[PDB]
From a paper:
8 The HLA‐I molecules present small peptides (8–10 residues), derived from pathogens or self‐proteins, on the cell surface. Currently, the classification of the HLA‐B35 family into two groups (PY and Px), in the context of HIV‐I infection, is based on their binding preference at the F pocket to specific C‐terminal anchor residues of the peptide (PΩ). 8 The selective difference is attributed to an amino acid polymorphism in the HLA heavy chain 116, with a small serine or a larger phenylalanine/tyrosine in the PY and Px groups, respectively, changing the size of the F pocket.
HLA‐B*35:01‐NY9 (PY) exhibited the highest thermal stability with a Tm (thermal melting temperature) of ~56°C, while the HLA‐B*35:03 (Px) exhibited a Tm of ~38°C, which is very low compared with other HLA‐B35 complexes. 30 This result is in line with the Px group molecules definition that does not favor a PΩ‐Tyr in the peptide, and so this is consistent with the classification of HLA‐B*35:03 within the Px group. The electron density for the NY9 peptide presented by the HLA‐B*35:03 molecule was not well defined, especially its central part. The larger Phe116 of HLA‐B*35:03 is most likely favorable to the binding of a small residue at PΩ of the peptide instead of a tyrosine. Comparison of the HLA‐B*35:03‐NY9 and HLA‐B*35:01‐NY9 structures revealed the different conformation the peptide adopts owing to the high mobility of its central part when bound to HLA‐B*35:03.
Residue numbers in the entry:
A (entry chain A): 1 to 276
B (entry chain B): 1 to 99
C (entry chain C): 1 to 5, 7 to 9
C-alpha cells in the first residue's frame, strides 16, 4: 500500500510562564513512533511504537540533539514572527511545522512536504517541486528571502528524496506486521426510533487501521450526503479507528437505505442494511 | 484565531455492563492548543486519566485523546468536560453507548 | 529520522 512519514512540530510561547514549549511527534501513516517535549522533566526523544525501540543509542542521542537544537531555533522564530507582525510581547503565539515524505505502493517517492503555520494560519510552504516557496504574506516573504539566501529548499529536497525515504522504508520493514497490515472495519447497522414517524439508522465501522475510510448512506441507490450525519474518524486507543454515519429515515422505509464501506483492508467495498 | 474543539465521548470496545473497557474523550479541530479535559463518573472528576501527545491535522487544528480504564454499568453515568479559550463555560458531553 | 536543516 501507500505509506508516509510525517513529523509535526509545535512551538508555543507563554509570556510570563517561562520559555516557549517545543513538542515534536513522528508518525508513519496513523502510527505515532516518537515524541519529544521540552516540558518533560528530562527532555529526550522517546519511543511511542514497539518497532522503533530496536534503534540504537546513537539514534536516540542524535534525535534528542536535533529536537533540543529545534527548541532553541523555534523560540528565536517566535521572537522574529512577533516582530514581523508588530505584535506586543504580551500574547501567546504558536508556530507549527509539518514535513515528510509520501511513497507509492512500489516504495517510490510520490512527493515531499514541508510547511509552516503561524497562529493556525498558513505561513510558508515548500512547493511540490521541492525548490520554490509559497509565502502567505509580506511577513512570510522575509522568511522566504532568508531561506532563499541560505539554500534551505536544496537541503530539504536532499532530505525528502534521500534520508526521509530511506528511514521510512526501514520503519516499514521493522514494523511490517503492523505498519503493513490493514485491519478491515467490523461493520453493523443499528436502529434507533426517534418518534412514531422516524428512526435513525446508524452505520458503524469499528476496529479499522489505517484511519482512511469511506462510509456513506444511499437511499434507493442515491447518495444522502446532505442528510447524513458523519462523525469524524476517532481513535479507539489500541491503534484502531472508529466511525459512524447516521441517517433519519421514515418508519417502514428502512430497507430503501444501504450503507457503503470502502477501506484498504476490504477486498471489495461493503454494502450493509439494517437487519431486523 | 480561534477554533472551538469538537468533542466525542465513546468506548474503545462495544460496551458490556460489568466488563472492563476504556472510556475515551477525543477533542479535535481546536486552536490554540491549550485545553482542559476531564473525564467524569457520576459528575465527579476521574483522577487517573491519560492522554495522547499533542498532534495536529492538515488544517493545523490540534487533537488529543483522553482515556481511562472503566467498567460500564446500567446506572453509572460517564461524561467528558472540556474547557478552551473559545468557550465561556466548560462543555459537558455525556457518554451515550449508542454513539 | 528528523531533518537537520532554520530560524524564520
Amino acid at each position: 500500500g501507500s505509506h508516509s512519514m510525517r513529523y509535526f512540530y509545535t512551538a508555543m510561547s507563554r509570556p510570563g510562564r517561562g520559555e516557549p514549549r517545543f513538542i515534536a511527534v513522528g508518525y508513519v501513516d496513523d502510527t505515532q513512533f516518537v515524541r519529544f517535549d521540552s516540558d518533560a522533566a528530562s527532555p529526550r526523544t522517546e519511543p511511542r511504537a514497539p518497532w522503533i525501540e530496536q534503534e540504537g543509542p546513537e539514534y536516540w542521542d542524535r534525535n534528542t540533539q536535533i529536537f533540543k537544537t529545534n527548541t532553541q531555533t523555534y523560540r528565536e522564530s517566535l521572537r522574529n514572527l512577533r516582530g514581523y507582525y508588530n505584535q506586543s510581547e504580551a500574547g501567546s503565539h504558536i508556530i507549527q511545522r509539518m514535513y515528510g515524505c509520501d511513497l507509492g505502493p512500489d516504495g517510490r517517492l510520490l512527493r515531499g512536504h514541508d510547511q509552516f503555520a503561524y497562529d493556525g494560519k498558513d505561513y510558508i510552504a515548500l512547493n511540490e517541486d521541492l525548490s520554490s516557496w509559497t509565502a502567505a504574506d509580506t511577513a512570510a516573504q522575509i522568511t522566504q528571502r532568508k531561506w532563499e539566501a541560505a539554500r534551505v529548499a536544496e537541503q530539504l529536497r536532499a532530505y525528502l528524496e534521500g534520508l526521509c525515504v530511506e528511514w521510512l522504508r526501514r520503519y516499514l520493514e521493522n514494523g511490517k506486521e503492523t505498519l503493513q497490515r490493514a485491519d478491515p472495519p467490523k461493520t453493523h447497522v443499528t436502529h434507533h426510533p426517534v418518534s412514531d414517524h422516524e428512526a435513525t439508522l446508524r452505520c458503524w465501522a469499528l476496529g479499522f487501521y489505517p484511519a482512511e475510510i469511506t462510509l456513506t448512506w444511499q437511499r434507493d441507490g442515491e447518495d444522502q450526503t446532505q442528510d447524513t450525519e458523519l462523525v469524524e474518524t476517532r481513535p479507539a486507543g489500541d491503534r484502531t479507528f472508529q466511525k459512524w454515519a447516521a441517517v433519519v429515515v421514515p418508519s417502514g422505509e428502512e430497507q430503501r437505505y444501504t450503507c457503503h464501506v470502502q477501506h484498504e483492508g476490504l477486498p471489495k467495498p461493503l454494502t450493509l442494511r439494517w437487519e431486523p | 484565531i480561534q477554533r472551538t474543539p469538537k468533542i466525542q465521548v465513546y468506548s474503545r470496545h462495544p460496551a458490556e455492563n460489568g466488563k472492563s473497557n476504556f472510556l475515551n474523550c477525543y477533542v479535535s479541530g481546536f486552536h490554540p492548543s491549550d485545553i482542559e479535559v476531564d473525564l467524569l463518573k457520576n459528575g465527579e472528576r476521574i483522577e487517573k486519566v491519560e492522554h495522547s501527545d499533542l498532534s495536529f491535522s492538515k488544517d493545523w487544528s490540534f487533537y488529543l485523546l483522553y482515556y481511562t480504564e472503566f467498567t460500564p454499568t446500567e446506572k453509572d453515568e460517564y461524561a467528558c468536560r472540556v474547557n478552551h479559550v473559545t468557550l465561556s463555560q466548560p462543555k459537558i458531553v455525556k457518554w451515550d453507548r449508542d454513539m | 529520522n528528523p531533518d537537520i536543516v532554520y530560524q524564520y
